[PDB]
Amino acid sequence: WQVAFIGITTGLLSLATVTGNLLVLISFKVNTELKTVNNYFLLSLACADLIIGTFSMNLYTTYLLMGHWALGTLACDLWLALDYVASNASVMNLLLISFDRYFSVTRPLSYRAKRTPRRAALMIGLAWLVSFVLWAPAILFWQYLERTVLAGQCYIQFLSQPIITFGTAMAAFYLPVTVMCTLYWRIYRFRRRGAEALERAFSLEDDKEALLAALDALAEAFADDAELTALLALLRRLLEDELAALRAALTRFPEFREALLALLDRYLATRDLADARDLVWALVLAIASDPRYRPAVAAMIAFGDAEVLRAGLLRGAEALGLPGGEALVEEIMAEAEKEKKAARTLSAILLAFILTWTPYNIMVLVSTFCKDCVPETLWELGYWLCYVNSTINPMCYAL
């Protein structure tokens, strides 16, 4: 009764883990569209979750119910090598996606030509090899450093100390989760500055300070370029001489920038207080309609793009005058919705990670502060919950 209740739940759950893992991996070779950099990291995540669903969850619950595996299975070393290697290659892949999106939102042009489907192979391989040299040599050959599995019923030999366990908890969950949460602070507040500025520039037409804030947000976005940052700074200082060089920065990437000069003249020869907002929006639209700047703006039009930014970009296109700008705006917001889906997927995986690893982590923190604080059943629930993250991961992509 009690034994069969647990076993049924994790037997069907393991099937959902590996079926989704097997389906997505063969889907990369089925459709040649899911090999891109953004989805390449998901491939490594899927391989890791496949490993820890095939060889870690099943054996974990088999140990938990049929306690006949304690100190009786010599494949436990391989099982935990795969376990820790896949778990760490999922943690490092989560932080690698976090750093990749932070550098694609704050350095989106240095990373434009530095994030291709061939450098993804190198980045993913470096992450996987780092996880390997961390765990697989260690988890396996630490015993040789006690030839048998050192007193190991199923567990890992070198994770036996409160300080060592706390250090792993920090450097794998704690420190990475705070790091990711810091880049999420930066990215969320950055996209929020962009969205609030571009909304006060659309919901208010008499606030020249909101326009300055929008230009400052764009400069914080487009800081890699000398030309673009110089143009934004000059446009901010124009309203907040050497204005001849201003058109040199405007005519440095002229594809449809002919109307940019006309808008600049109209907004700087009439001492405009609101036509500068139209100029800023036309500049944003022109930047968006570029093969290199599209992800840069698309990242910032991910968060606040409910209603305000669609209207803002539409007004900018209507002021720019592009013959066919509606299709360009539709494509730009399609890219923005793709960025929104990617960000929501990142948030879902991060929240599942934090909602399934925290409990174990929290109990690890209190395992050095009055150690006798939680019973064995709560610990087992937390440890199994950590594996539940693998089950959700294919479902995160599918939704």
Ligand X SMILES: CN1[C@@H]2CC[C@H]1C[C@H](OC(=O)[C@H](CO)c1ccccc1)C2
Q: Which of 63, 79, 84, 184 binds ligand X (CB under 6 A)?
A: 84
- Of 206-214, 234-242, 343-351, 359-367, the segment contacting ligand X by CB under 6 A is 359-367
CB 96 within 8 A of CB 81: no
Residue given tokens 């982590």 in the structure block: 361
Look-up of token digits 């019973």: 375
Comparing CB distances to ligand X, the nearer of 77 and 196 is: 77
Q: Does 357 bind ligand X (CB under 6 A)?
A: yes
CB contact set of 157 (below 8 Å; sequence gap of 6+): 139, 142, 143, 146, 149, 150, 151
Enter the tokens of residue 150: 């050192």
229 vs 188, 277, 360, CA distance in Å?
22, 18, 46
What is the per-residue binding string for ligand X in 152-171, x denoting contact by CB under 6 A?
----------------xx--
Between residues 239 and 354, which has the closer beta carbon with respect to ligand X?
Answer: 354
Out of 111, 360, 391, 396, the only residue in the binding site for ligand X (CB under 6 A) is 360
142 makes contact with ligand X (CB under 6 A): no
Length of the chain: 399
Q: Can residue 96 be called a binding residue for ligand X (CB under 6 A)?
A: no
Q: Which is nearer to ligand X, 267 or 387 (CB)?
A: 387
Q: Which of 42, 91, 120, 276 binds ligand X (CB under 6 A)?
A: 91
Q: Which stretch binds ligand X (CB under 6 A): 33-41, 66-74, 79-87, 178-186?
A: 79-87
Q: Please count the CA atoms within 13 angstroms of the CA of 332 that sit on its side-chain side.
A: 31
Question: 68: how many CB neighbours lie within 10 A of its CB?
Answer: 10
387 binds ligand X (CB under 6 A): yes
Which amino acid belongs to residue 268?
L
Interface with ligand X by CB under 6 A: which range of 61-69, 191-199, 261-269, 360-368? 360-368
Q: How far is the CB of 381 from ligand X (least distance, A)?
A: 12
Candidate residues 315, 383, 388, 397; the one interacting with ligand X per rule CB under 6 A = 383
d(CA 159, CA 177): 20
- Segment interacting with ligand X (CB under 6 A) among 235-243, 284-292, 319-327, 354-362: 354-362
Q: How far is the CA of 375 from the CAs of 110, 252, 381, in angstroms?
A: 51, 67, 10
User: Is 172 an interacting residue with respect to ligand X (CB under 6 A)?
Assistant: yes
Question: Would you say 303 and 195 are in contact if contact means Cβ atoms under 8 Å apart?
Answer: yes
Comparing CB distances to ligand X, the nearer of 92 and 333 is 92
Interaction of residue 88 with ligand X, rule CB under 6 A: yes
Q: Of the ranges 86-94, 114-122, 291-299, 303-311, which one interacts with ligand X (CB under 6 A)?
A: 86-94
Can you say how many angstroms the Cα of residue 278 is from the centroid of all Cα atoms in its chain? 32
Q: Which is nearer to ligand X, 289 or 393 (CB)?
A: 393
Do 292 and 225 meet the contact criterion of CB atoms below 8 Å apart?
A: no
87 binds ligand X (CB under 6 A): yes
Short-list 54, 53, 50, 25, CA closest to 40: 25
* Gaps in the chain with C–N over 2.5 Å, residue before each: 145, 240
CA distance 351 to 101: 17
173 touches ligand X by CB under 6 A: yes
Does 128 sit near ligand X (CB under 6 A)? Answer: no
Summarize as ranges the residues that interact with ligand X (CB under 6 A): 83-84, 87-88, 91, 168-169, 172-173, 357, 360-361, 364, 383, 386-387
